[PDB]
Amino acid sequence: ALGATTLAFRFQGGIIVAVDSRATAGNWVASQTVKKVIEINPFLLGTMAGGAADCQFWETWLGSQCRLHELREKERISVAAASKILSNLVYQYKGAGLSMGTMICGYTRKEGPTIYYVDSDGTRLKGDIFCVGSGQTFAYGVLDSNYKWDLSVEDALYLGKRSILAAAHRDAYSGGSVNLYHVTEDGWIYHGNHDVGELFWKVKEEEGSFNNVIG
Amino acid sequence: TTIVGVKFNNGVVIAADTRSTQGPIVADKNCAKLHRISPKIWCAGAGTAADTEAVTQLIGSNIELHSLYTSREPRVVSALQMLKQHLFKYQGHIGAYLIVAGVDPTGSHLFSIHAHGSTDVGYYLSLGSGSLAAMAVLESHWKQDLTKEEAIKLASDAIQAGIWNDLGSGSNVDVCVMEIGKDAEYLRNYLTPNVREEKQKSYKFPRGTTAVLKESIVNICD
Amino acid sequence: SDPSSINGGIVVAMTGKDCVAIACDLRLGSQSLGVSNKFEKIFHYGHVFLGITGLATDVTTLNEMFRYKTNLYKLKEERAIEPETFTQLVSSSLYERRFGPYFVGPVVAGINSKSGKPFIAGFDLIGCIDEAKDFIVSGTASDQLFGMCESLYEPNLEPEDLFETISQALLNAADRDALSGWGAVVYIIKKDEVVKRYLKMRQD
Amino acid sequence: TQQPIVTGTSVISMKYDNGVIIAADNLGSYGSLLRFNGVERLIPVGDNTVVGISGDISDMQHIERLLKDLVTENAYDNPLADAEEALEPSYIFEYLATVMYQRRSKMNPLWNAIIVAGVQSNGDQFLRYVNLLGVTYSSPTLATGFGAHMANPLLRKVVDRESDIPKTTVQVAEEAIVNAMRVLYYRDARSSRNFSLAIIDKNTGLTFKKNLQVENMKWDFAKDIKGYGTQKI
Amino acid sequence: TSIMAVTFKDGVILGADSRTTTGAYIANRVTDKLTRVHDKIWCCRSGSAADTQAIADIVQYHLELYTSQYGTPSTETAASVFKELCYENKDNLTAGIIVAGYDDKNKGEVYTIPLGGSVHKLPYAIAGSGSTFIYGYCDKNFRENMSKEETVDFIKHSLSQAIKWDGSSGGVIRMVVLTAAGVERLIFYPDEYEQL
Amino acid sequence: TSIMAVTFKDGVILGADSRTTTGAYIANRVTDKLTRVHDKIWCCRSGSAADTQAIADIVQYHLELYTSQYGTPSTETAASVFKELCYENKDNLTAGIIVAGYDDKNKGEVYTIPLGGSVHKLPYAIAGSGSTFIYGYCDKNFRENMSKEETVDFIKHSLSQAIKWDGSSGGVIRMVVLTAAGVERLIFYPDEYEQL
Amino acid sequence: MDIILGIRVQDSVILASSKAVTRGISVLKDSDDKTRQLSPHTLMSFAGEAGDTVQFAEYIQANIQLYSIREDYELSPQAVSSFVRQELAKSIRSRRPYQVNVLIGGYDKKKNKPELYQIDYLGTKVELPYGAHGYSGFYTFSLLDHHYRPDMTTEEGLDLLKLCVQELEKRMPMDFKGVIVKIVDKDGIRQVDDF
Amino acid sequence: MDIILGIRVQDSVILASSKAVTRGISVLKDSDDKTRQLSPHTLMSFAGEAGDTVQFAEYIQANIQLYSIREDYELSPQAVSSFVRQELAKSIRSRRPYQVNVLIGGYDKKKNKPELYQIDYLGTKVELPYGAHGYSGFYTFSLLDHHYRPDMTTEEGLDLLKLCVQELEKRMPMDFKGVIVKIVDKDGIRQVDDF
Amino acid sequence: QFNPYGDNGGTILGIAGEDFAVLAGDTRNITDYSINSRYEPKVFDCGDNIVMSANGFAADGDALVKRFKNSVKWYHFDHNDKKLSINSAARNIQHLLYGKRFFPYYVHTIIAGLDEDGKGAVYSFDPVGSYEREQCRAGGAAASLIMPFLDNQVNFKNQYEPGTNGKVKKPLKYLSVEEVIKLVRDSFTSATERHIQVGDGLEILIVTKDGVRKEFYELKRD
Ligand SMILES: *[C@@](C)(CO)[C@](*)(O)[C@H](CC(C)C)NC(=O)[C@H](Cc1ccccc1)NC(=O)[C@H](CC(C)C)NC(=O)[C@H](CCc1ccccc1)NC(=O)CN1CCOCC1
Ligand SMILES: *[C@@](C)(CO)[C@](*)(O)[C@H](CC(C)C)NC(=O)[C@H](Cc1ccccc1)NC(=O)[C@H](CC(C)C)NC(=O)[C@H](CCc1ccccc1)NC(=O)CN1CCOCC1
Ligand SMILES: *[C@@](C)(CO)[C@](*)(O)[C@H](CC(C)C)NC(=O)[C@H](Cc1ccccc1)NC(=O)[C@H](CC(C)C)NC(=O)[C@H](CCc1ccccc1)NC(=O)CN1CCOCC1
Ligand SMILES: [Cl-]
Ligand SMILES: [Cl-]
Ligand SMILES: [Mg+2]
Ligand SMILES: [Mg+2]
Ligand SMILES: [Mg+2]
Fold first, then answer.
1. Number of H helices and number of E strands within chain E?
2. Which keywords fit this entry according to its UniProt record (chain D)?
3. E14 and E42 in contact (C-beta within 8 Å)?
4. Is there contact between G and E if contact means ≥3 C-beta pairs under 8 Å?
5. B1 included as an active-site residue
6. Alpha helices, H only, chain F
7. Pick from A153, A156, A166, A155: which is nearest to A199 by CA?
8. For residue A56, which phi and psi values (nearest 5 degrees)?
9. How far apart are CA B35 and CA B61, in angstroms?
10. Which residues have C-beta within 8 Å of that of residue D98, sequence separation ≥ 6?
11. Rounded CA gap, B57 and I50, in Å?
């Protein structure tokens, strides 16, 4: 039962991944410092939406399976194969009550930047843009209107950061802070933690947006 | 809640704790559960807080008008009868559990009333979530021919049993003594055995700690 | 489908030395969706202040109702209503709807013009009065406010100090509640002057 | 998933300076029917432990059998079975608590509330509770069912904390227990007048008292009570 | 509850226990379930304490108003008023009442009123949760035209057994004797009746 | 059902009615609820007819196998086998059984086994839906070390009342006498016991 | 899911409302106007339970028109919105409540300012720069929150509105068959025929 | 409501399948291919419960490909359809059944005839000239019943198919984001990129 | 129907310092409105300078702690008496909890100790195994009361530097063990006042490189 805003999108320079940090137990805000990006390995990322434990446990388990693959095959695992290992696993547990909605993100030679939406009822979708969580609608709006394939890395990082902010503002169960990631062929790069409180006022002033809010 | 009533030689005494809950939360640490129906007829209330206050005030109002109409001091049985008929009519939906006590020209009286409209007579009574803890004390220490000072002791000891052992009850002990031929004495916070200890630190903030966007003078005058 | 937690919101009130303070957040939502950041929950009828949390339609309705009743009170009595009397009016009006109640958590705050004594009070949805020396809390973050107020509060605070204490109680409680926040307002009330300050808080 | 049929009510106990006391009435109820009157719900294990059980009686008889079998098994290939390697209250308790939690985890509980009272080999008093959920706790006073609501308040007036234990004698502690059993007879609708009481002392050992009765009761004031309010006759 | 009323040579005797319960908790151990609706017309109350009290209060009002206009009412008339209330409000009541009274013409009479609101005139009646355990005993031991002392022993022994087996019954045994002589209240304590 | 077993000077006597019901319809008015599990160990059956028959058949099998290996079993042993079945299958059974037997050493013994599967050794036992109405009568009239004729009258009068008040009990009164002399079957018809 | 949107700009109020009427698995109509003119400078759009919507809108319309005739005077948008709120506030505790959500767009001629009011079926009123009902807000508010400026023109407001409709048409599951757009300003109410 | 259609004409089988994938109030994707090639001359489209659809389709695909390698021979559409039916017939009485409906379009090289099979999740097989699953049949069957002729060409079949999609886009409540069309004939399987 | 879960109340608190860490918890055990024990410890020394508490349903809490203590014991056997790091213990506990994902332990778990750099560490778990390292964490009945207070006093949230127009935040800094215990004591006395399930006593376990020290403080018993 976790409110969240997670996104991931393909572009010229690889993949951007952005998430919020809030965890709620009803109305009660349990945490503002939750890590919703799971570092499966140095080349693969996973997002956490739905069950926190289900996502943590099985995407950590996934990293173990990926390490065993490259030990036996002497080759990096494809994003396709990694995502399918996870989707086939949760499909076995279908009906039992697992709750997940995740994006498995990676950049390889044969595939290029690749994103797979994997979900607890067995769904496995390849795509360019994905948004998941209680605040996904708010983030989609900013993404759809501003997204282009030929985005620069600087502008793409801002777009993902701005999209989470949009949801954090409107969605009650999204917020805390923003965690950014850039996925390249040589691995992922962490682009810091950004407190939404400080980030909102900063974006308001610099961008001219959020006129409905007094500041 | 924990509430009790005890009869003695020349009158009757009632007592109550002072906790008021809202789920597992303590809303009021020092609330008054002892109500005045008439000068010498007082009521201890347990259950739904609004209901006990509302029903005691309504009957108290009607008792006053009745006392003026009849040119007589009100009787406990009148308050008892008026309360139970009101509660019975609402089939328990008004969640008031009361201990009614007082002195009148007929003598000293002690009754209890339940939400559905049933009444009981006794020398010692207890109601509320801590009634079992209180009744255990009453059953252990009560005797016939109690004095005023013995009855107050027994009553407050019964409330303390509820305060310590029942999570629904807590804080202080209120008492009201109704003796024949005398004015009723309401002893608010008769015992205060749950005083908060000194805090380890002062949390007084330096001035200007809080960030402010706008200031403005509010006009309360005409 | 719990009327008291659809729209969200909080109100807190405190006493100081020859003063009172009452504060509220500005959020109005429809469950997860935030709708307005200008929804003030504190109203005043003369020098008596009333904060109301709960279902927003009932908040608006009750304000209009007590404005109605206090205006008629003043015309007949030829004087403004006092906090102690207003508290009883609120209780009466709510219990009148005992078996079809307004889903609200009101809070009264003010200073008696005759005696000069600071006064605060709280109610449940059917009119039970909760009078207090120290503080009153209400709303979806009432648990959080109870924890802040019980530790931060001390008696006989000066208006300027009292302002900081109530503001910090509200802000940190609101940040641990999803349905509260999006702005805040604090009223500092002295015998013959009232200051209203808008706080800067995180907007998530 | 069960439902209890034949049941036993409160079991009460407390610590005193040299040992522990435990008591329970001799009734086996069948709903509102007070069906069986010769039921012993205190079961000694060795000469240093007494297990008091409330709840379902068929499940109680099962536990009796387990404890009896536990003594037999401990004696196997054990020359010090009546000495250093004899059964301790802490051993007996942990065994039961293990069983109770395993049974709740299989959704097939033993519908009981148990108090294990005894004295350890080093003289320390042992008093601990366990129930159908596998929940465990210890305290200077322990009670089950109605006893938790009515007896504990009375026993805690004697021993309110740990420091009050050396100050409490066996005479005073026994008096409080017997008084508590009377109060339960006044106020528990599934209780009986007849009961058993057991004392485990570090010096005088195990004293098991059967066929006790509640006495010195107050009923006389009932004659003065007439009607339910207005009635004078 | 355990309650009963028994007719005999000189009149009628009502009998009852003194226990009031809330689940398994005894809310009152010295309850008075024998209640006066008229000088020599009394009733035994079983079921809801609230319902039976409300009913008895109304009946007492009706019979007081009857007496002001038409003089002393019959025991049959009293039972009819009880019935009318219990029958017409059967959906909202839980009350098992035994009506007992003494006339000079009709002598001792007993009417029982179960849940439905039906009326049954009997030589003796038993009711309440504890009555189930003494149907056999009471049927075997009841005789018509017993003496006062015999009738007291019959009620005492009967309610003694009812109390022994029924957890919902206990405390003291109250009795009310209705004869031409007047109205006599009796009480019997545990130490006496338990060891019968 | 109404069933009972009573110990006396020379041994033990089992007693039962003969009614079997499906709702309010009497499926069998001449049922035999007294059943043999061993030469001088019998049982009274109450509850589900299917369950009690299945149980008794298994116990008879266990005691027949016991006898082949270890000789004649005790009445306590028989009660233990019944208990084991009733306790371990308590979720799927509705059986209230009274076990009664005669040893030469232990004489007459009675064990009752309620729904839960608990065991209770008693001087006498009563069970079944109709037993509720005779708890008072049986408690007042039972004595230890009665004669055969006294015990027969006690059971006859007791079950007579149980049948009179319980709609789920009726027909004939069957009895089985267990002594050193042997096994004697008795029967008593309505015209006799009804007018007691 | 009847999509109704509202945007208040510098000098006007713009209301956009979906054209589809669906019943079961069939789109019965694709040209439905989900609005009523309450007065020359006040417009109300609506969405909610079938039947209740039109019945409520026309009932309000009749009451406001009655007021206009009686006083020979147009009620302010604020006054109309308060009247509408009170009717819904009564309704929610009735035997069968009106399950209708509304937006009220009006131009106040005394203040020379446009005004947009959002009122849900419970009687929850708020004045806003931009508003929506149902799931519509979940998509558009992020866009409006970003691109909305308080000093925009009517033409800039229509472009901002087009951006919202495009986003809804992309991400919403149901086909709502486009929108009818209407503008409220100092000169009254008019419809944009080509959208 | 994942639209899947099928039309058997003179010399080919045409399958049309919707592109939308919806989850809650969001269209997650608008370019989804709801089909798998079982063999060079056999194509299966599918629709139903999320996860189950793809898992089932790929499982069938693997089994048919295994058969092809083992025997160095392509199974007939009739044989493949029977195998698929039996798997669903087993499934329906399992602990957790596959909730998947399929159309199987194939060209039989021995008979030189196109063949279309409709199989629902219960294992209910029928050979048809035209077929559909879900609510799709409720709109299109009347059109197909009318304009369908057995001697039509592939181009005539595509025009007939366009007519069905237009009717669905007009009357269906949900936006299914168009269709991917594929043709199965003597030369194998190919996709129509512009539809 | 049989309900295998229960609520034994209580509340716990873990704070992490620079070179130390504390794990506190009240000693009260309850069921409904009754008190089972005024002193029933639920914070345990598990070895290897790891302290642990599992609050909620006591039976599940005792089982988990017992299993983890056992896990530590076998880690030594299988890995040549290697010291179990706090991060390794956390991951191990995740697997214990998730092993019962479809019949959970109804507990909120918190562990405290020192990381491999010697700095204070606190980890918190949900009932099914999700975990996170944190500076500050309250768990249990009164977590909602305590936690926002810690946010304000430990992490200095919503506090800005005086005179800076709310532009410059108050700087984060490590607190002393003495200052931390003050906050813990004040946190629990406040929670005791307003939560009925909190009281009786407070037991704190402090963890430094030197070892594990204990401190006990009385709380209100009402
Ligand atoms: C002991 C302390 C507890 O048994 C006593 O019995 C006291 C009696 C004194 C105070 C007169 N009882 C209570 O304090 C009583 C306990 C209780 C709670 C709920 C139902 C029945 C009894 N508490 C109350 O009545 C509080 C009083 C507040 C603290 C001023 N009221 C509530 O808890 C109300 C319940 C109102 C109610 C409505 C309809 C039927 C029954 C009760 N609950 C809320 O306000 C909760 N919620 C908050 C958000 O707004 C919507 C309601
Ligand atoms: C024997 C006990 C049974 O036949 C007697 O008949 C006596 C009659 C005397 C007192 C005249 N009956 C009772 O004592 C009677 C038993 C009973 C209970 C419920 C329904 C019918 C009969 N007890 C009561 O009426 C008590 C008296 C109070 C404690 C002073 N009242 C309750 O138990 C109320 C009754 C509410 C009610 C329910 C259905 C119909 C009418 C009224 N119940 C509660 O308070 C609920 N209680 C809350 C605590 O948890 C357990 C349930
Ligand atoms: C007295 C009657 C009650 O204590 C005795 O105990 C005897 C015991 C003798 C026969 C050993 N009991 C019965 O006669 C017994 C009563 C009974 C009924 C249901 C459950 C438990 C006890 N009657 C039966 O067992 C009959 C015997 C048949 C007619 C030969 N069986 C039924 O009534 C079956 C039982 C099904 C069942 C239900 C629950 C648990 C176990 C078995 N029921 C039906 O046929 C249903 N019937 C259909 C027609 O409409 C009414 C219901
Ligand atoms: Cl009564
Ligand atoms: Cl049979
Ligand atoms: Mg937010
Ligand atoms: Mg019969
Ligand atoms: Mg207490």
1. 5, 12
2. Cytoplasm, Nucleus, Proteasome
3. yes
4. no
5. yes
6. 49-70, 75-88, 135-141, 148-165, 190-193
7. A166
8. -55, -55
9. 12
10. none
11. 59
Domain boundaries, chain I: 1-222
Residue E100 β-bridge partners: E42, E110
Choose among H61, H16, H71: nearest CA to H40: H61
Rg of the Cα trace of chain C?
A: 16
Question: Which strands, in side-by-side order, build the sheet including H125-127?
Answer: H35-39, H42-48, H100-108, H113-119, H125-127
Residue A51, chain I, CB below 8 Å: the answer is: yes
**How far apart are alpha carbons F132 and F129 in whole angstroms?**
6
Q: Which of C29, C176, C183 sits opposite A172 (nearest CB)?
A: C29
Domain I1-222, CATH 3.60.20.10 — does that match?
yes
Could you give the 3-state DSSP secondary structure of residue I207? strand
**Are D70 and D95 contacting, i.e. CB atoms less than 8 angstroms apart?**
yes
**E-strand spans in chain B?**
3-8, 11-17, 20-22, 25-28, 34-38, 41-47, 96-104, 107-113, 119-121, 124-127, 173-179, 185-191, 212-218
**Contacts for E74 with CB less than 8 Å, ≥ 6 apart:** E101, E103, E106
Which CA distances in Å does D16 have to D20, E121, F93, H72? Answer: 6, 61, 46, 90
Local structure of residue A133 (DSSP, 8 states): S
F133 contacts: CB under 8 Å, gap ≥ 6: E132, E133, E135, E136, F161, F162, F165, F166
Residues in chain D, how many?
Answer: 233
Which option is the CATH number for C1-204: 3.30.420.40, 3.40.1190.20, 3.60.20.10, 1.10.287.130? 3.60.20.10
Q: For chain H, how many structural domains are there in total? A: 1
Query: At D55, is the secondary structure helix, strand, or coil?
Result: strand
Q: Whose structure tokens read 């709380």?
A: I219
Write down the CATH superfamily of domain F1-196: Aminohydrolase, N-terminal nucleophile (Ntn) domain (3.60.20.10)
Query: Which of F1, F2, F21 for mutating ligand 3's site (highest number of atoms within 8 Å of CB)?
Result: F21
- What would you report as the CA-atom Rg of chain E, rounded to the nearest whole angstrom? 16
Beta carbons within 10 angstroms of residue C197's beta carbon = 18
Beta bridge partners, D42, equal D52
Q: How many helices (H) and strands (E) does chain I have?
A: 4, 12
Residue type, position D146, single letter: F
Residue G33 falls in which region: left (phi positive, over 0), alpha (psi -120 to 50) or beta: beta
CB distance I131–A96 less than 8 Å? no
Establish how many alpha carbons lie within 13 A of residue C204's alpha carbon, considering only the half-sphere containing its beta carbon: 29
Q: How far apart are CA E52 and CA H126, in angstroms?
A: 73
Q: Which domain holds residue D125?
A: 1-233
Name which of I30, I10, I97, I87 is nearest I60 in CA terms.
I97
Q: Compute the Cα dihedral for A48, A51, A56, A57 and give only its sign.
A: negative
User: Between chains, do D136 and I8 touch, taking CB under 8 Å as contact?
Assistant: no
Residue C149, CA distances (Å) to B208, C12, C135, C198, I145 in order: 19, 9, 7, 20, 10
Which CATH number covers residue D136? 3.60.20.10
Q: Where are the alpha helices (DSSP H) in D156-222?
A: 170-187
Q: Looking at B1, B2, B52, B56, which residue is catalytic?
A: B1
Check if the beta carbon of residue H17 is closer than 8 Å to that of residue H7.
no
Cβ neighbours of G73 (radius 10 Å): 10
Residue with tokens 């959500």: G101
Closest to G11 (Cα-Cα) out of G147, G185, G189, G192: G185
Distance CA(B79)–CA(E59), nearest Å, equals 21
- Count of structural domains within chain D: 1
Experimentally, the structure was elucidated by X-ray
What amino acid occupies position E186? L
- Residue G167: its chain A contacts at CB < 8 A? 140-141, 144-145
Between CA I221 and CA D161 the distance in angstroms is 11
